[PDB]
Subunit: 318 residues, 3 copies
Amino acid sequence: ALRGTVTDFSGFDGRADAEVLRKAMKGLGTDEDSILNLLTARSNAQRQQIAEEFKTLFGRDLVNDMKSELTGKFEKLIVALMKPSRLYDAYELKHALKGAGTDEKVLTEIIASRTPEELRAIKQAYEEEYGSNLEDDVVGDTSGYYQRMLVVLLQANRDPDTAIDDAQVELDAQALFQAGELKWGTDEEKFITILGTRSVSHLRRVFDKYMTISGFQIEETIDRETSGNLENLLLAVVKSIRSIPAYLAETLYYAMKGAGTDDHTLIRVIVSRSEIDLFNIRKEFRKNFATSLYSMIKGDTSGDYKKALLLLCGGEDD
Amino acid sequence: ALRGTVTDFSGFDGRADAEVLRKAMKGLGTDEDSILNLLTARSNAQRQQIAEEFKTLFGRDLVNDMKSELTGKFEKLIVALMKPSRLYDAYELKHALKGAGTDEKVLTEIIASRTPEELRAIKQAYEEEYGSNLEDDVVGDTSGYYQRMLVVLLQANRDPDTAIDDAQVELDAQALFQAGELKWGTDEEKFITILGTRSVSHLRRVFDKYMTISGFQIEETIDRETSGNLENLLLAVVKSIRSIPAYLAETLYYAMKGAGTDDHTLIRVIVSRSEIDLFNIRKEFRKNFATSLYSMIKGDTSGDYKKALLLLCGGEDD
Amino acid sequence: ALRGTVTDFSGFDGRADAEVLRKAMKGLGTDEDSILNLLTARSNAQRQQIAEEFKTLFGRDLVNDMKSELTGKFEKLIVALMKPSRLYDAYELKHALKGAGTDEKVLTEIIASRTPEELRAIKQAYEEEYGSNLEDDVVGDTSGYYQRMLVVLLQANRDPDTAIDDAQVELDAQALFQAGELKWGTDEEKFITILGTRSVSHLRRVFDKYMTISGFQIEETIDRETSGNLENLLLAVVKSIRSIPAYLAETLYYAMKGAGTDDHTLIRVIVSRSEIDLFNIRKEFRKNFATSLYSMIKGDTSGDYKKALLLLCGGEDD
Ligand SMILES: [Ca+2]
Ligand SMILES: [Ca+2]
Ligand SMILES: [Ca+2]
Ligand SMILES: [Ca+2]
Ligand SMILES: [Ca+2]
Ligand SMILES: [Ca+2]
Ligand SMILES: [Ca+2]
Ligand SMILES: [Ca+2]
Ligand SMILES: [Ca+2]
Ligand SMILES: [Ca+2]
Ligand SMILES: [Ca+2]
Ligand SMILES: [Ca+2]
Ligand SMILES: [Ca+2]
Ligand SMILES: [Ca+2]
Ligand SMILES: [Ca+2]
Ligand SMILES: [Ca+2]
Ligand SMILES: [Ca+2]
Ligand SMILES: [Ca+2]
Ligand SMILES: [Xe]
Ligand SMILES: [Xe]
Ligand SMILES: [Xe]
């Protein structure tokens, strides 16, 4: 079911593309339109080959040249598009990690929404790129049950999806009820073990049974029982278990709701998911907010940045 | 013939074990008894899996938590037990290497008693763990013929055991006689080449022939001809060629002989050899010192430390 | 057709060799003659095995000992001979790279004359040895079109030799004519793309056609149109396309022409090419300068340095 919005261009000629891009920047000024039309129409792997052909022909670094010619949010988007897909989540995490100035929204968004297979790949790329252990750095800049839940998720050890055992569903739903609503205070450890390690298909059934038993959705309990960064993370984990595309659609919605735009979040989501499930994200977005992702981006963004974003997204008639 | 005292626990459940350990430390105080009974009854590989399950369930680092809860020599022993077997000798060497403050006893003990196959593995683990070349660091903190002999041994290039050539045995025994007892001064280079590079089975025959020719055991010549760190190393090499378990039994004996205990040596030997030849060490110990290793540990050690050591050793009725 | 002047010694005994070398340095003074006669008569791989046997027997580092005993240009040559072949070009490049004090002659000589297969191997060895990216370091210490051409060559992406297309030969020869002689100023980008990326066999035909069209050899155009480091690099690239051995023969010729000797260049060329094409270099040298490489070295060099160089070169009767 999972589909992105960007695929390999048929009849790709990396050398031709590199020439077009050189022409766009060569000499006075910059043809931003030529740049954005080309790069939004090539897959990430294809952008890498363009970069290598550009360096072969001209002995210039393509990204460095674009960083020189381009400006503002447009530049930020183009540089994000050029990052190899295998490194992008790691790069975003690395840039989130910076002392008490750490960007917890980013840690939560990525770590909650990436699959165990994705996280294994992220941990490897991060260590190779930056010479540090991701878990160590996360532990360094976080504290409390928030850190613990992140470490649990970073183990990428979630139970595999297997046949559902109804008695285990009952036991876990009851455990959660006893650990939160029936407890003075909260047994956070219990929530973390169950939400962090049980399989996705098992937890979906647990969530339904928990509603049946308690009269609350698990998200309602979480808001009633916790707060702060732990609350945001537990909500992101639950929402991701229910539907990753739905959680990411919501993330996009809130980046553009209110005054201005959370541009960093907008760029990160669109670029990171453009070859995975951005199509599914569009669908969830239109189902849940009765408005196209396209029309919300169109209304929230300006100039070449807007143009490039809309080309990546598609879905005018969503 | 080689047997350790610790083996894989049958019916191992890493998750269950992790829960037991969490219960032991959770909240006020610490159940040291639960900790030592469990960990001494699991193999090193099994301890690693427990650590991974603990982190998966609770998002806590098991060793860090134990370092927080435990104290003293007991803590030192538990942390030593948790070090992956493939890294432990490298860790001990790294910790021995520290300027003119270097711990030569440790360099000698490990490098003399480990097989060429073990040393190849140690050199690799050390470089991977610490980003340094073991040989370079040894050379950095040692001097003289002591350093040279260590470098020779670090090459892990000892002749393989093959059919014994009686004439070569005669030649080497005579060479040794001429290089030491018949020489004004000592040709250390000759001792180092022969002791450092000839095969174990060849040198065992050389030692017997040397006694026949000279009327001295090679160990007696070494004490007569050399002194200081070179003497200790040459003795350790000879004793290891004769019997590694016997050399390690002697090492343990002297750690506990006299006032107090060399606890660092006691922990290192017991832990490092617990899955290789600690059973053989016990046997040599009882043969050579007419007393059980168990009874000597029992008499020399206190509290939870004593309990854990005795469980690892076994051999009450040795 | 490609032949070196040094090959594997038949009946090689690394242990025997190590003993000879130890004897040469042991005690007061040094037997330089024994050292140079042996090492010039062993291949690079064989020198590595000698070094390992020396360390195994004596626990001494062979190169460190030679650095201690030897002096001057002789020492520099012996140390160069001991560097593993797979690391030598990388070592020379690393030593060329040092701020505005950078040795451009070395960057040009190596990068222009090494094949794409050789450069791939060099880039890998450099990163492994020094923890840095070669391209990054080159970019750091160079500027302008000189840097660009070096980066192009460092991509090691030259078109493969395939069937020649006469129309493409015409197009490229005309392109070059239009980019230089017919242009006010020079389109350096065009020269760099064509000279840097087209196949060797294609460019050889382009050079002939360019002469036919313009009445100039490409080297004459280069001198007419460019200057400085870019000129030297473009000439080295063209000369290498025509004949690597011929370019290296010329490089040697100029190292010894005039007062004194460029010893660093002499050592680098002889050692780096001794197992590849130094025989071909000798032949080109004798064809083009009507004098033996041997006789020029003999006349330009002194002492043990001279002796060792002449043994490596051969070709008294060239
Ligand atoms: Ca421009
Ligand atoms: Ca413009
Ligand atoms: Ca910019
Ligand atoms: Ca509660
Ligand atoms: Ca709340
Ligand atoms: Ca807005
Ligand atoms: Ca506690
Ligand atoms: Ca207690
Ligand atoms: Ca402690
Ligand atoms: Ca003597
Ligand atoms: Ca003595
Ligand atoms: Ca004692
Ligand atoms: Ca000497
Ligand atoms: Ca001399
Ligand atoms: Ca010297
Ligand atoms: Ca011109
Ligand atoms: Ca010129
Ligand atoms: Ca000269
Ligand atoms: Xe919670
Ligand atoms: Xe000795
Ligand atoms: Xe040129």
